[PDB]
Structure formats: structure tokens, C-alpha cells
Amino acid sequence: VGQYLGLETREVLGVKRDYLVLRYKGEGKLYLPVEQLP
């Protein structure tokens, strides 16, 4: 079960990157980059 918490423009490693923001129920807040395929 992954809950989709929307897209978000976070800056990491010294600058921007958008990620698909998911909270897996069970807990982690996983940020998944749009640049990757899945």
C-alpha cells in the first residue's frame, strides 16, 4: 500500500528536483524523482 501525496519541487544535492511524493503506509515518506521511469 503506497499512498500518493502529490508532486513536490524539492531542492537536493545543491539544487531543485521534482519528485513524486508517496507515503507508503507502514512508514516512510518516499520521494521518487520524475527523471526516473518508475
Binding site: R10, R17, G28, K29, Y31, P33, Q36
Partner: protein
């Protein structure tokens, strides 16, 4: 006076009711911001970067009165918002991680530990606030080390801020600082 100098001192070392970005580079904040980020490149692509975002000090569950009657310790819990960057992928993993209980300092210098009114004498020349912050740095430096080690001998993919972080070394370091605190005679 001294209590008033000393109280505020500890109170600025924690910045406990100060919003995270209105926080000065002092005590813990420095300790955290300086000791973090922990990177293991070492694998040609990636390994991980673990960065610090903020720390949360809980607010006290028992008041000083409650604490001296019910024989309890007067302490707020400490959490850190940690974040694991896979540069191999870009993937990020946030987590608020529990780093233990910080004793709060009552209005007259004393801490309340298990009902008892205990004092950390500064003998002196480095106030109680910086004495703690200094020892905090050491703990964190050790904790910073459990992570560096796990990164090396775990599968990056199954690793996450909570798994890398072991608080024991931070706590051991605190226990010892507040362990040899003495009982008060007011």
C-alpha cells in the same frame, strides 16, 4: 546572579521553543548542522548522503510540580528529521528519528531527575549550556559513526534513515553527563 545566567544559557543551547529556521548556530543546532551530512560515496555511483533538516524538542509531559511529587524526571523528547539521498537514483527518504530524552532546566538551575532536585555545577568557565552541547557533539560524532558503518555493510536499497541511526551512543554520552549531576541543598 548565576542561576539566571545559567538557566538562559542551557535554554539557548536547546532553542527548544524556537522555530527551526529562526534558530541560531549554537549548542545542539551547531552540533547537528556541523556533524551532518554523512556520505559514503565510496561505491563509484552513489552510496548515500544522509542530511540534517531540523530537530524537534518535545514539550514536557509532566510539570516540575508533578515531577517533584510523582517522583518523575523533567525531560522533553528529542527528534531529528533525517533524509536519505540515493544519488545512484535520486530517491529520497525522509524520517523523524528518535534521539532520546533531554532533561529540561527548571527556573533555578536544577534538573528534576526521578523526583530528585539535581544540579550540574560549573567549576567553571564553560557554562552548563555549553558543557552539555559539547558532550552532545561527542555522542552525535559516535552516532554519525554507526551510520557510516551500516552504509558500508548493508544493501543501500534496503537502507533508510531509521535503520542507519542508532541513538545509544548519543544517549550513553548524555546519561554520563547528567549521570554525575549532584543533589541540591537549597
Amino acid at each position: 546572579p548565576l542561576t539566571e545566567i545559567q538557566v538562559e544559557s542551557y535554554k539557548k543551547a536547546l532553542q527548544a521553543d524556537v522555530p527551526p529556521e529562526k534558530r541560531e548556530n549554537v549548542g545542539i543546532q551547531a552540533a547537528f548542522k556541523e556533524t551532518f551530512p554523512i556520505e559514503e560515496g565510496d561505491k563509484g555511483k552513489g552510496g548515500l548522503v544522509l542530511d540534517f533538516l531540523e530537530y524537534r524538542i518535545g514539550d514536557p509531559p509532566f510539570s516540575q510540580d508533578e515531577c517533584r511529587e510523582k517522583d518523575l524526571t523533567y525531560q522533553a523528547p528529542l527528534y531529528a528529521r533525517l533524509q536519505l539521498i540515493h544519488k545512484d537514483t535520486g530517491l529520497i527518504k525522509e524520517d523523524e528519528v528518535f534521539l532520546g530524552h533531554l532533561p529540561l532546566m527548571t527556573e533555578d538551575g536544577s534538573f528534576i531527575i526521578n523526583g530528585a532536585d539535581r544540579v550540574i555545577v560549573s567549576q567553571g568557565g564553560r557554562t552548563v549550556g555549553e558543557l552539555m552541547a559539547d558532550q552532545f557533539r561527542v555522542g552525535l560524532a559516535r552516532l554519525a559513526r554507526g551510520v557510516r558503518e551500516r552504509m558500508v555493510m548493508g544493501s543501500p536499497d534496503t537502507l533508510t534513515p531509521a535503520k542507519l541511526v542508532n541513538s545509544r551512543p548519543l544517549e550513553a554520552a548524555l546519561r554520563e553527563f547528567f549521570s554525575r549531576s549532584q543533589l541540591s541543598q537549597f
